[PDB]
Design a protein around this ligand. Sequence first.
Ligand code: HEM
Ligand code: HEM
Ligand SMILES: [Ca+2]
Ligand SMILES: [Ca+2]
Ligand SMILES: [Ca+2]
Ligand SMILES: [Ca+2]
Ligand SMILES: [Ca+2]
Lengths: 678, 678
Amino acid sequence: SPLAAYEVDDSTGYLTSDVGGPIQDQTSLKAGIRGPTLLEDFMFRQKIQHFDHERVPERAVHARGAGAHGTFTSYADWSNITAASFLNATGKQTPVFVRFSTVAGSRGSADTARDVHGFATRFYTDEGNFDIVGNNIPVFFIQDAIQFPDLIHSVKPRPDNEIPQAAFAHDSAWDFFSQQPSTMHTLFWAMSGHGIPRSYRHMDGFGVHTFRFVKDDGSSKLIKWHFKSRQGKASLVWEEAQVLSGKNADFHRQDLWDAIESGNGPEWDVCVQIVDESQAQAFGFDLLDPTKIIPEEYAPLTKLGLLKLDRNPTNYFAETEQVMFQPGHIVRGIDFTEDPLLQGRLFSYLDTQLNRNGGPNFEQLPINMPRVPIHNNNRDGAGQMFIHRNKYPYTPNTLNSGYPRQANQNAGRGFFTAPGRTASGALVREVSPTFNDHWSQPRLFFNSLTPVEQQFLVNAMRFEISLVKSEEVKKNVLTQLNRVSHDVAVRVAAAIGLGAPDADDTYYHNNKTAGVSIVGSGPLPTIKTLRVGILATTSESSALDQAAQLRTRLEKDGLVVTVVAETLREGVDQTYSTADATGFDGVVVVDGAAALFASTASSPLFPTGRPLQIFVDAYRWGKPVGVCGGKSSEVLDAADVPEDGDGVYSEESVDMFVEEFEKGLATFRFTDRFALDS
Amino acid sequence: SPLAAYEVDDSTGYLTSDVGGPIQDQTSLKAGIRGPTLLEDFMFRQKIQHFDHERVPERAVHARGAGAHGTFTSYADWSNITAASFLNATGKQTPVFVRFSTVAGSRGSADTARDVHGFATRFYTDEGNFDIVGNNIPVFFIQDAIQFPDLIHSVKPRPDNEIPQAAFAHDSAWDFFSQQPSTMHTLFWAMSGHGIPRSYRHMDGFGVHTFRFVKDDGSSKLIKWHFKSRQGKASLVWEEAQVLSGKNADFHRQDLWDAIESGNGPEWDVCVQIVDESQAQAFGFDLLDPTKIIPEEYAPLTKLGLLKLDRNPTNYFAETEQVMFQPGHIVRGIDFTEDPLLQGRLFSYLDTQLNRNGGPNFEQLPINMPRVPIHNNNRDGAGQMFIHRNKYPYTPNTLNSGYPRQANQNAGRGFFTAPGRTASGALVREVSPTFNDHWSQPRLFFNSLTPVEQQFLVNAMRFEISLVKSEEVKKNVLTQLNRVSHDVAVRVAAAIGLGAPDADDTYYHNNKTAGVSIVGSGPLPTIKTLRVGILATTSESSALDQAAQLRTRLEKDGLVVTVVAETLREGVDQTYSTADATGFDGVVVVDGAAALFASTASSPLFPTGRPLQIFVDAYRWGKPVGVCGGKSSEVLDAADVPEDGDGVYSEESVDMFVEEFEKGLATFRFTDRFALDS
Ligand code: HEM
Ligand code: HEM
Ligand SMILES: [Ca+2]
Ligand SMILES: [Ca+2]
Ligand SMILES: [Ca+2]
Ligand SMILES: [Ca+2]
Ligand SMILES: [Ca+2]
């Protein structure tokens, strides 16, 4: 409904050309029944011309993603810190569109690659469109926008053969990281669980840069944007992400679509850290440096409002593929800072839409339109939709009585640059020495992870680095890792055949910061939408009965239940042949199906050992697993799963099973199942 | 070579702009060292503009693919059957470029999706570029080019949410196949192992359409192109293909690249079936219908020459992404037929290149250039790279002395339409009744597969169709399947909880045809490039010695050997953490590593049970597997793998192990390991 005016219905009627002439489109016009096709067949050509031109260039980065519509609602009148109109009253609602994404892969690459992720939000405000073009990691790899193509060429596939897809699994990416140590912070983030989130709904959004909030009186404060998930933070484990990439490349986009269709649209509290202009260098780093966070211990979050996504697109291409974000889409009340990464973005996003749209009128696409009137003297250009009535589109004029009028701080609610901003000094292509500590914050982030989480990050490093051919590059990588943590360097080095360099303690410290760990962020606040696979059998009507019973108990609490069996029928959603543990957040075997549970289990209907392997994989990957009905030994012993294990459940009673199992879903992952380096 | 002149060497020198001005590109120009970026920074803007515009539209279909250069060599002077110059002398060599692809997936989609595959070959002939734009399956889904957008919309992701990336795993695709029964032949091919080829090198190429060979005397014959692999035919198994999609999305592009680098460039015999014009309707179907094969029993293959691919591109984007094939790239000695699918293709490929290139001068890209002089009156257009001297580009002229001269059948070796061709009848948008048997050949194909191959095809259909939500679509699928084979329909129906319709014997028959089965095609003629994984341990110096002695022997037979252990070091190529059975065509455990091979082991260096799961997966997927080093069947017992099994090896002596295992690699798959229906 927000784009309802542009909708085209085809639920009735006869086929027409694009100019409304009724036509057919199923057989070519030929010179005889077995003859050649005629050039005069305009039906053919118009249809095939359209087909032939359907594709547009993918985004230069973040090509793989998915989007949805929603609403933002303000918690207060924030005129005490910003003139921004969308934040000017308690309860004030503004429509939004959000696109989530990975970064490196092309538009058909898997959701569950290890990567940084995008979180781009458009507020269609009553004073113009405002975009916050963020990521799920609060810091960036580089400190100057001019370096963006260097970073992106290095992580994207090698350009002789376009291998590999899979940003971290090759020499060039680690060459760049080891030569450009600014990269360490974001690298450590991407090697954590934040690189493989469980869903777009279980990750946060960050503006990354310091921005300014500007009041109507001209005064300014420095801010960081934080969109804090109300679904909780959660990750995949790496092996699971790898399997999912193959079994369901669409996993994150489907998770989002489904959550919305079920009335479980995801929410975030939109927050800021707010600090004075005089605290630009007060926190031990420079707020212009996008490789640093402000620890929450120095600057707490202020909740500004609620973001909720609750309506899927009607046409993906028209809405999600064509949405064209820009940090240049700014509104009165907000300003830029002199972060050199942000500064250059402002150029990039206006220019790149020429590439994608093929012409200058991209703001006229329905998804890009504002929801207020446009008054300016921009004209013409390919694809111009507007029929402008003002035949004197110049300023200054008298022949249009001086309209449109100039808007500025003092009239017309113009945008204005924060008037306290200044520049001083030589015109330079020099990096500020205040940017030079590339290692302290990576150590702060590492120190804030739990032991098992540190292990997972080491293990991701071990996995990726071991795929680098060049022994020199590997050596250079350990030089940098060792500046963050000697222990990381040692542990990584052990997997890859090299010695770590001697400890260099210049940047070592034991400080920690809250709110960055996933494993430490406690049980999820809600288990609605989480997936429970019930493994049953058609060979015992009792097993189906148990499955049906469990289904109703689980569905009542908003879990999404899949009953698996050998073949489909009423009440069974999925065959063993298609099922996989990656499909579930928890796995329950009904004891009527215990006979299936052997690695022995053979059938033309599924691969040998499949039922058991679903259970075993679930267990190995940390998930809650159990057996419902009272008889658990045969299944559990076949799986080599201990009955007294944490997150392993066995009960006859369905109610008591479900009560226990739902606590395990909230815990989400049983990290005691993963080995630690000693 | 038009490509050698445009190669750019950046191995030395200072950075310049695109107009040769030396510059830097690492720091933006700023007003002071913590200041805003300046608009006058041309270094910044030229770099970022280029980045911002790097991407071009992907191909409308066959977006995912990979290419190589090579040579075609004629085996004879074929002037007795065609005027074509590249085929006019024994030993005549012509440069080629080939791109292979899937069909439905975008860029970045995995190579090992179930799909039809492209095999497009450019012959840079001495009489112009000649393209054969083929597929690895000899028949196409539809019988008229006007239906292409219908087919492609139906198999591409649902356009509200762009889900799913798997072409056959959704309702719309099956809706289309069940409403458009022409699709049955290609559908059966795609559900066979030809949907998941082991590599590009292990599949054939087909022109699909009937074409004409035209002699210099104007006479013509009807032909089908067959490019027959000299590597042998081979497939993946489905579960393996799904895992590979996640573990290595680049699997086929890497396989090809690596084969060429190692001097094992792939080969095909370029063959034709040749039949007289009078046989258009002699074989029980119409040669204008691209849903039908001519059985080899009725028309044998004649070998024309050798295709070999032996040089990789220098820059993927410039060469592989930018190659623009067209069936309109035809040469004297070849002509079209009135196949309504081919007829419309001729329009599409010229038009769609305007989309991809953004302008009309795409034939000037080096990869698209010919190898002979161009003489015509085409002029101007965006991106015009030539400086034409002739200032009277019109015919007829006297001001340029009547040049260029018209070329035709008599003068100048012109292309000419086969002079025997005629048309007669009304101008109609009607399908020929001779196209109406949509079911007999699908059954011929199915009858030709071996029993376990028929099971694989049933199982693929069971898998995909079980993912269709609509019970009606499922019913309608069964209706069509049942017209090809009641048994297929019964066996598919059993997996999806419907009953099959009663037998309809109109199109049933028991005929078979040679050369279409993969499982039946016998051992591979070469094992060069095949991958052997040797699972070892760093714990035991015996294990590493055993792996080295095995390696050195296998490597001499052209096998690619990977030694896997817990960590890298001398002699060890890959860690258990990154290893997968999908990485290998055969797996060996050295008996010194026996202690790793339990469902436990446990280590922070790899996931629990990973060593044994590599071996177990390899066995379940049909691969030759064994233990080298004697007396130990502790490994075979932990894996539940029977020592007496075909393709299971156990030998103390490295030489007897290598002799046996090398036979197993040629056999390739041990299909006794897969269960059949009852
Ligand atoms: C803080 C750093 C950055 C963040 C958080 C970020 C975020 C993102 C996001 C989320 C998208 C996808 C938006 C959508 O979903 O359509 C994107 C696209 C893109 N970004 Fe960035 N970005 C960063 C830095 C850079 C820099 C430094 C440049 C260039 C100098 C750049 C150039 C682009 C380009 C060209 C696109 C494609 C835009 C399109 O086609 O509409 N970004 N960015
Ligand atoms: C016998 C049936 C067909 C075969 C074997 C076939 C084969 C292929 C191949 C191999 C490619 C990829 C070439 C490359 O690697 O760049 C391709 C691309 C394409 N085909 Fe077809 N095709 C068939 C039918 C059709 C039909 C009926 C149409 C349209 C009416 C069509 C339109 C296209 C388009 C638009 C492209 C993209 C070409 C480009 O951007 O360069 N094809 N085809
Ligand atoms: Ca590389
Ligand atoms: Ca984690
Ligand atoms: Ca254009
Ligand atoms: Ca669908
Ligand atoms: Ca002619």
